[PDB]
Design a protein around this ligand. Structure first.
Ligand SMILES: *[C@@H]1O[C@H](CO)[C@@H](O[C@@H]2O[C@H](CO)[C@@H](O[C@@H]3O[C@H](CO[C@H]4O[C@H](CO)[C@@H](O)[C@H](O)[C@@H]4O)[C@@H](O)[C@H](O[C@H]4O[C@H](CO)[C@@H](O)[C@H](O)[C@@H]4O)[C@@H]3O)[C@H](O)[C@H]2NC(C)=O)[C@H](O)[C@H]1NC(C)=O
Ligand SMILES: *[C@@H]1O[C@H](CO)[C@@H](O[C@@H]2O[C@H](CO)[C@@H](O[C@@H]3O[C@H](CO[C@H]4O[C@H](CO)[C@@H](O)[C@H](O)[C@@H]4O)[C@@H](O)[C@H](O[C@H]4O[C@H](CO)[C@@H](O)[C@H](O)[C@@H]4O)[C@@H]3O)[C@H](O)[C@H]2NC(C)=O)[C@H](O)[C@H]1NC(C)=O
Ligand SMILES: *[C@@H]1O[C@H](CO)[C@@H](O[C@@H]2O[C@H](CO)[C@@H](O[C@@H]3O[C@H](CO)[C@@H](O)[C@H](O)[C@@H]3O)[C@H](O)[C@H]2NC(C)=O)[C@H](O)[C@H]1NC(C)=O
Ligand SMILES: *[C@@H]1O[C@H](CO)[C@@H](O[C@@H]2O[C@H](CO)[C@@H](O[C@@H]3O[C@H](CO)[C@@H](O)[C@H](O)[C@@H]3O)[C@H](O)[C@H]2NC(C)=O)[C@H](O)[C@H]1NC(C)=O
Ligand SMILES: *[C@@H]1O[C@H](CO)[C@@H](O[C@@H]2O[C@H](CO)[C@@H](O)[C@H](O)[C@H]2NC(C)=O)[C@H](O)[C@H]1NC(C)=O
Ligand SMILES: *[C@@H]1O[C@H](CO)[C@@H](O[C@@H]2O[C@H](CO)[C@@H](O)[C@H](O)[C@H]2NC(C)=O)[C@H](O)[C@H]1NC(C)=O
Ligand SMILES: *[C@@H]1O[C@H](CO)[C@@H](O[C@@H]2O[C@H](CO)[C@@H](O)[C@H](O)[C@H]2NC(C)=O)[C@H](O)[C@H]1NC(C)=O
Ligand SMILES: *[C@@H]1O[C@H](CO)[C@@H](O[C@@H]2O[C@H](CO)[C@@H](O)[C@H](O)[C@H]2NC(C)=O)[C@H](O)[C@H]1NC(C)=O
Ligand SMILES: *[C@@H]1O[C@H](CO)[C@@H](O[C@@H]2O[C@H](CO)[C@@H](O)[C@H](O)[C@H]2NC(C)=O)[C@H](O)[C@H]1NC(C)=O
Ligand SMILES: *[C@@H]1O[C@H](CO)[C@@H](O[C@@H]2O[C@H](CO)[C@@H](O)[C@H](O)[C@H]2NC(C)=O)[C@H](O)[C@H]1NC(C)=O
Ligand SMILES: *[C@@H]1O[C@H](CO)[C@@H](O[C@@H]2O[C@H](CO)[C@@H](O)[C@H](O)[C@H]2NC(C)=O)[C@H](O)[C@H]1NC(C)=O
Ligand SMILES: *[C@@H]1O[C@H](CO)[C@@H](O[C@@H]2O[C@H](CO)[C@@H](O)[C@H](O)[C@H]2NC(C)=O)[C@H](O)[C@H]1NC(C)=O
Ligand code: NAG
Ligand code: NAG
Ligand code: NAG
Ligand code: NAG
Ligand code: NAG
Ligand code: NAG
Ligand code: NAG
Ligand code: NAG
Ligand code: NAG
Ligand code: NAG
Ligand code: NAG
Ligand code: NAG
Ligand code: NAG
Ligand code: NAG
Lengths: 531, 102, 119, 531, 119
């Protein structure tokens, strides 16, 4: 048989590439608005939720957008002054002086600051993280709502989604689907309970890199949402403080009525039913032992409490009432409001979240749960699972676990007799390239780099084909005979009962071996023609 | 819960001999989950092999090891005078009792 | 990697010790600071690790409730406070940096500090 | 004969193009780490060290990286205050007050400042260049070490290196070599003695644009390194001063022990031997006269003294003991330490180099020497050479003098009978294009522009070939006959004993003359085919 | 190009003159400021040039040690100080900007100032 070059082959390899956000018609929609799906029969791929790259790109893209969106906003470096704070409870009435819009005049102002937002230096205080970070007020009239964000692959790449319902996150998938853009991924911020996520279709899904390793957070996806309604019941009045030419500093002031506590309600009915289901499921994935739950260990109020972000107000709700051992009721959780918060900890940056008049309410759907396992030689056959926080990428591993990014690779060199998107991935070689697959190779600075790179890969494949005498045609018979050492297989074995992927795995060792022969054969043919 | 028993014996040997050391694991784990440590008499322990086959920096060539599943093994070809100290097999979290060489 | 630990002293029943593992010369934030208990002429034990960027800590089932592991990142010094010590707490105490610090992802404790032999 | 188009021809032309730094696995390695070399037999090229462009790009890339690296660093605009300075010698103990981290509180601090870093306004002083420039502290925990930097050419270009040992910098080269990436070029900073450079292989190499012109620095390369060990022996103690939210200002304070002088040792053995060799060599490149040396003229301590940068401390060592007229010993040079330095003089910028505790030592290898010539009608037959400083590009002309950047130009139109990297540069036309040369045309914003430009040149050559009926083939016989006016030469003269380069020089006048005929001939052929 | 020079005065043996060549209306930094001595009804002479961004100066062999050429860039005024003048220093003094200022790289002095006839 003789070498034969096929262009537009449905095969791929794992790779790292720049994607781009799309969103739907704000911090995110400053992304270009759009989602086709096609099932891939007979295809099995080894997915990996943990060694993925879309989480490591989603993290950096959240950092980049949060830094970009907070550049034309106020900087509270003039506000780092001594604060005369008295009791108004966890709230302090703080009086201080400022350099007003007329610079040679000083004005005394008042503001209600929470005790978590100030540290002492008596009654003299300063705003927390002034002497380590540069606080930046979150801009009003620009909402920071987590709108759904799709991830569309660039030219020459594709995204495979695993449709197996019981898929835990690692290993083979029963049947997959190539898509352009992922589903709406709300970029939520949480610590111990994943909020507003995607529910599991049929069953509870538990995942870790290795359960016997204890430094590795265990993700648990609920197939049934648990309602959670939470609220800040204080009647705040927002006061504007002018500190410069167009810079305004919004503070709380003069709460009206009772100073009530922010609480976070969960229902004792659906909760502990879902938790008993989780307990039943975690019985099987270990040696038989009693499965039961403990509160969080010591740590930063950022990890010891279920934190999130509701309407720009940062809640820190204790979860000791959830993970401590059954009828209808309510599991009302105390919460602490924090204004100066530094999430995704950047040394030298903070964030003053401005206050809101009236009250707010926070209704969300718990669709997940992050856990960890205590170790030691504790015997007694009971495993103590505590909630775990920090390492923010986990919150986006729960939404990017079905997806995988693959690099499409043409030039599937196979032998034949002659000489001289991804719909057919699982199909055998016997019984379309130009119509469907090949046209999909061209159809800020990040998304410009990925498009220039798409152009380079299209030219670095088209030039190879042109140098192998294949300028205008997709299938070429070539003048290089098929060696016996290149895993010699019969035509029956190859073009029947064997898919393109297994063939790609078969002769991956002979890359840059047939290529040199093709170059020199084309050059020999042309130099014979000219002579 | 992962039980790491170690073989008995005190290995009454002289310099220039060899030494075979072994550690057992209670579950079918891969080779990456087990490591070996020198335990000196009253100084900080150091690591030789992590992953049951990959040597560490600043370590001579005389130490080798292999194993998969159960019955992991360490072998030293030439016992220098400093090598007559205790040796520990480390799991994820639970250390080993430590086989003895005199 | 420089780790400079503190000094030991016998603590009577009901006291509290605060041992330190002052680090220098590396990325302290992206580094676990596992703690290890050496029983006297006996096998080691795993006290607990502390991620220092968030304080997220996990102790052993044996010492769960009796110990607490604070960390300071400004001066890049991790802490370990042990209350309610008894006379059976005779041991040595070292701090090991590993768990993906080295090439392998599994717990591969390389650098160790100076020891602390609180009885 | 008939026109014939060859694609992948080994010829080139001098051009200006964007390169890119590579470095090896910091300010520079924030560059993408990598270097093939191939000798070019029978090739002579007219190199020019002075009209080069890599020096004018290296200068701007040092400016760009030094500006980029000093953006997230402290700005000492609050520190421009009155300084109560007394004697501690050249060092002054200066006490002053600052606006601390709490803005409505002032703190008095002390600091040891050199006399060169302050100017009077008594005992009241201010930091030098405050009222003309914005001082920017060089960031600690980011080393500014001059790591070796390679220069790799983009797609479609190449770098020729001259391997002739006695090559002075101008004129023909005996044999050259095409490379991808240059050698490790340490971007050192110096004034009168080139430090840590590349030694000459066999003999001392002297160079100027024109020696009879006196405004033009004479570079001299030593083929033997001269050891030079230098040191600041003061036992400084660094004190941190907090001036804002995360901004720290590092000062010297409380020197311990004797206040010793920074000195720079050279050996009187190897020096004056190398200088006698230089004298012998400079006898020949002028009319016969006695060759002998004078100290530097008047000028800024930046040019009157051999300046450099050792561990971030800026030394200014006087060279009057070197260029003033023989046995073993030491030539110990006094030095003055300067913290506030403004090199590559940008109007409105400075640089506070932070201090270091303990002492430092500065061992380096003098591999070069910059000189100039006094003029006038001085008679007596003695030529007075003084060291010369400033014009920083000279320090990188000494390292980029063997190299030259060339633009690869296909479409080497030649006549034949028929009708219808750089390895073979010096080879005759009789007795490879696709295998070796053509695949090398595609294989920040600067390095993205140069790659988009590479794509444009590949499309502007491939489109030309496609419009000349040469879509998939590299060699084309065409329907345009070879005029007698296009320097008509026989087949024997052209395809034997004549290289591609001389042929390119022969018919360079007829560009955009044969091209129009090729376009209209292809269009005529196609319109005949359709009709 | 505007060059505004200063006024002259006869200087006794041992005095010091400080003549100026105050420039305006161009890039003073990227411009040499060569000085030229006109002997009385005789051929010219090259006193010396001064690069004003660094002060790097080169004088003639005749006046090497007796002259000094300072420059000020803030007010874009170059200077030339001559000490130890004798009665044989009768001449005129002008400042010429050239040496690649014009198209040609070689010394092509175009614009000249106002003259100064210190005897
Ligand atoms: C999980 O998902 C749930 C469901 O999506 C989220 O809960 C919603 O959060 C949004 C965004 O914060 C809430 O929208 C806000 O509601 C407020 C009340 O709006 C009502 O009342 C006003 C009159 O006062 C009517 O005009 C309006 O139609 C409603 O009837 C408003 O205060 C907010 O408006 C403010 O923001 C918008 C930005 O879009 C500005 O344009 C406005 O000027 C104004 O500043 C806003 O509309 C919504 O109410 C919540 N729904 C429920 C059912 O509670 C959870 O937040 C989410 N969980 C997490 C952790 O993110
Ligand atoms: C021409 O070329 C020579 C040779 O390369 C250069 O001289 C070297 O310069 C480097 C860079 O400044 C010097 O490296 C520095 O050395 C110091 C001493 O290190 C010794 O001691 C410490 C213990 O104190 C040991 O750990 C170490 O192994 C050595 O034994 C250190 O103070 C420096 O470390 C500092 O910088 C690094 C940045 O890489 C930081 O990571 C550190 O935290 C710390 O801040 C540094 O290593 C080197 O010693 C010099 N060599 C010699 C032989 O003198 C010349 O500078 C160069 N000339 C010019 C003009 O550039
Ligand atoms: C997530 O699901 C995957 C499967 O989709 C689980 O992989 C399973 O891993 C265990 C070991 O951790 C395998 O057990 C052993 O495998 C070897 C071959 O590798 C075999 O020789 C042994 O007899 C034993 O079976 C198991 O086969 C493998 N697959 C399946 C289908 O069970 C993974 O553990 C799951 N993890 C989590 C955290 O949810
Ligand atoms: C660096 O080396 C080059 C040669 O590689 C030197 O070029 C030489 O320049 C001089 C004039 O400066 C030439 O002398 C004259 O050349 C003309 C022809 O151009 C000739 O007609 C005269 O008789 C006389 O020879 C000389 O030929 C030329 N080349 C060589 C090989 O000597 C250059 O001067 C050197 N410069 C420095 C500063 O090192
Ligand atoms: C993909 O789905 C298939 C079923 O379509 C899973 O195969 C079996 O599924 C049943 C029902 O959940 C389990 O009891 C069996 O243990 C599964 N077999 C094996 C060999 O695991 C398959 O596991 C699914 N893949 C994943 C990753 O969950
Ligand atoms: C989520 O999964 C659980 C566990 O499989 C489902 O609970 C089962 O519900 C069926 C309803 O017919 C009962 O027969 C089973 O006994 C339940 N199992 C347990 C362990 O209680 C639950 O229905 C699933 N939820 C959804 C929305 O599909
Ligand atoms: C929060 O406090 C404000 C204080 O002004 C309340 O607004 C007042 O509401 C009363 C209702 O009787 C009106 O008569 C006043 O005119 C309102 N004042 C202003 C300035 O608008 C507000 O109602 C309080 N909110 C709640 C939920 O109690
Ligand atoms: C939590 O999930 C439930 C469904 O499980 C959501 O209830 C639906 O909300 C949509 C919103 O478009 C309504 O159109 C449906 O009628 C609701 N369904 C039912 C059965 O009530 C609920 O909104 C989710 N909660 C939040 C806060 O988003
Ligand atoms: C390139 O090298 C050749 C020798 O291989 C040089 O040619 C002669 O070299 C000798 C030895 O240095 C000199 O004495 C001759 O004067 C050189 N001849 C000429 C005509 O110059 C050649 O000069 C070298 N090229 C350069 C630029 O140095
Ligand atoms: C650098 O070049 C000089 C000058 O050619 C070399 O010095 C010569 O060394 C040889 C050694 O055999 C002596 O015979 C010559 O007399 C020396 N010449 C002079 C003018 O003194 C020197 O060896 C070269 N250095 C290197 C490292 O190659
Ligand atoms: C530079 O001065 C410091 C001042 O502290 C010296 O450090 C002291 O060194 C002595 C040596 O006997 C020790 O006893 C002190 O404890 C050290 N003090 C501190 C704070 O570390 C240092 O040795 C001096 N360096 C030199 C080269 O003399
Ligand atoms: C100056 O150059 C000499 C060689 O001429 C360097 O000495 C060598 O340094 C390397 C460093 O890797 C050592 O491995 C060699 O053994 C040294 N050679 C000899 C003959 O001693 C010297 O290091 C250079 N100086 C500096 C400061 O870089
Ligand atoms: C704070 O304000 C009260 C108002 O009565 C005043 O008496 C007190 O002195 C202030 N505290 C400080 C520290 O200035
Ligand atoms: C603030 O400034 C005012 C200026 O009138 C002064 O009266 C007051 O004491 C200052 N107090 C504080 C606490 O900063
Ligand atoms: C294949 O994926 C499709 C997606 O529409 C799904 O309906 C189907 O159940 C999957 N196949 C199996 C065997 O689960
Ligand atoms: C919250 O504010 C709304 C708006 O007026 C009011 O109707 C409601 O009673 C308030 N409730 C609480 C609990 O603060
Ligand atoms: C999958 O394999 C079956 C085997 O019977 C075959 O009929 C089917 O066509 C294959 N799938 C595709 C997409 O060709
Ligand atoms: C083809 O087979 C022959 C058999 O002799 C062998 O020598 C040669 O290396 C093979 N070619 C390649 C490219 O593997
Ligand atoms: C300054 O910052 C440190 C951490 O770097 C913090 O512990 C300290 O409390 C701060 N200072 C004051 C006065 O609050
Ligand atoms: C400088 O400090 C000394 C300290 O004794 C003080 O007497 C003197 O007045 C100060 N000088 C000025 C100008 O304030
Ligand atoms: C600096 O400020 C302090 C404030 O206490 C004042 O005492 C001192 O005189 C001021 N001195 C100088 C020299 O700026
Ligand atoms: C040609 O360059 C090579 C580079 O390896 C060098 O060895 C050789 O000496 C050069 N030729 C001549 C004649 O110098
Ligand atoms: C320089 O510092 C080192 C470090 O302690 C010391 O050993 C040496 O004696 C010092 N020498 C001088 C000359 O300052
Ligand atoms: C250089 O010219 C000689 C002339 O004899 C020839 O033999 C040699 O092949 C030429 N070089 C190349 C690279 O072809
Ligand atoms: C070709 O030669 C003829 C001779 O008559 C001349 O007129 C014509 O201009 C030439 N063509 C070109 C393109 O030079
Ligand atoms: C202000 O800057 C000028 C140069 O523009 C300098 O000569 C002068 O000394 C500076 N002023 C003071 C008070 O030092």
């Amino acid at each position: 048989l003789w070498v034969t070059v096929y262009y537009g082959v449905p095969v791929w390899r794992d790779a790292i590439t720049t994607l781009f956000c799309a969103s739907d018609a704000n911090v995110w929609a400053t992304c270009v608005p759009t989602p086709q799906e096609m099932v891939l029969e007979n295809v099995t791929e080894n997915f990996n939720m943990w060694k993925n790259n879309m989480v490591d790109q989603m993290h950096e893209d959240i950092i980049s957008l949060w830094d970009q969106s907070l550049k034309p906003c106020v900087q509270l470096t003039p506000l780092c002054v001594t604060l005369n704070c008295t009791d108004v409870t966890g709230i302090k009435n703080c009086s201080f002086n400022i350099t007003t819009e007329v610079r040679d005049k000083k004005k005394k102002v008042h503001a209600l600051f929470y005790r978590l937002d100030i540290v002492p230096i008596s009654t003299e205080y300063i705003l927390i993280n002034c002497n380590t970070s540069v606080i930046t007020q979150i801009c009003p009239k620009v909402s920071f709502d987590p709108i759904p964000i799709h991830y569309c692959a660039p030219a020459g790449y594709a995204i495979l989604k695993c449709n197996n319902k019981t898929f835990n996150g690692t290993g083979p998938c029963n049947n997959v689907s190539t898509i352009q853009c992922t589903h709406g991924i709300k970029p939520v911020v949480s610590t111990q309970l994943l909020l507003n996520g995607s529910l599991a279709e049929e069953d509870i899904i538990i995942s870790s890199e290795n359960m016997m390793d204890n430094t590795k957070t265990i993700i648990v996806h609920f197939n049934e949402s648990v309602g959670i309604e939470c609220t800040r019941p204080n009647n705040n009045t927002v006061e504007s403080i002018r500190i410069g030419p167009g810079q305004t500093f919004y503070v709380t002031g003069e709460i009206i009525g009772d100073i009530r506590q922010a609480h976070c309600n969960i229902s004792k009915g659906n909760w502990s039913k879902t938790l008993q289901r989780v307990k039943e499921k975690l019985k099987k994935y270990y040696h038989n032992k009693t499965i039961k739950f403990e509160p969080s260990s010591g740590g930063d109020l950022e990890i010891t409490t279920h934190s999130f972000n509701c309407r720009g107000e940062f809640f820190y709700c204790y979860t000791s009432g959830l993970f401590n051992e059954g009828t209808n009721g309510t599991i009302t959780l105390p919460c602490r409001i924090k204004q100066i918060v530094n999430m995704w900890q950047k040394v030298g940056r903070a964030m003053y979240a401005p206050p809101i008049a009236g009250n707010i309410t926070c209704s969300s759907n718990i669709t997940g749960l992050l856990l960890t396992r205590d170790g030691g030689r504790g015997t007694n056959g009971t495993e103590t699972f505590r909630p775990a926080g920090g390492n923010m990428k986990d919150n986006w591993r729960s939404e990017l676990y079905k997806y995988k990014v693959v690099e499409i690779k043409p030039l599937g060199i196979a032998p034949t007799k002659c000489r001289r998107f991804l719909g057919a991935a699982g199909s055998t070689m016997g019984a379309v390239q130009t119509r469907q697959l090949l046209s999909g190779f061209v159809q800020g600075i990040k998304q410009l780099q990925t498009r220039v790179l798409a152009i380079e890969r299209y030219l670095e494949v088209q030039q190879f084909l042109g140098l192998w005498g294949c300028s205008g045609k997709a299938i070429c018979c070539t003048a290089v005979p098929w060696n016996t050492t290149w895993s010699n297989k019969s035509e029956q074995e190859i073009w029947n009962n064997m898919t393109w992927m297994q063939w790609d795995r078969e002769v991956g060792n002979y890359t840059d071996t047939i290529y040199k022969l093709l170059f020199v054969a084309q050059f020999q043919q042309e130099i014979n023609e000219v002579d | 819960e992962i039980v790491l028993t170690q073989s008995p014996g005190t290995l009454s040997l002289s310099p220039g001999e060899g030494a075979t050391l072994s550690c057992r694991t209670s579950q079918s784990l891969s080779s990456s989950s087990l490591a070996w440590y020198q335990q000196k008499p009253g100084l900080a322990p150091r690591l030789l092999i992590y992953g049951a086959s990959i040597r560490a920096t600043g370590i001579p060539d005389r130490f080798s090891g292999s194993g998969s599943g159960t019955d992991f093994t360490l072998t030293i070809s030439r016992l220098e005078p400093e090598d007559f100290a205790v040796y520990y097999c480390q799991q994820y979290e639970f250390f080993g009792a430590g086989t003895r060489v005199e | 990697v420089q780790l400079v630990q503190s000094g030991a002293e016998l603590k009577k029943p009901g006291a509290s010790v605060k041992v330190s593992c002052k680090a220098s010369g590396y990325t302290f934030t992206d580094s676990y600071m596992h703690w290890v208990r050496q029983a006297p002429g006996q096998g080691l034990e795993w006290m607990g690790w502390i991620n220092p960027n968030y304080g997220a800590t996990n102790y052993a089932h044996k010492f769960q409730g009796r110990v607490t592991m604070t960390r300071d990142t400004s001066i890049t010094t991790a802490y370990m406070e042990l209350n309610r010590l008894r006379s059976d707490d005779t041991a040595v105490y070292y701090c090991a940096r590993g768990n993906f610090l080295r090439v392998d992802y599994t717990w591969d404790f390389q650098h160790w500090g100076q020891g602390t032999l609180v009885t």
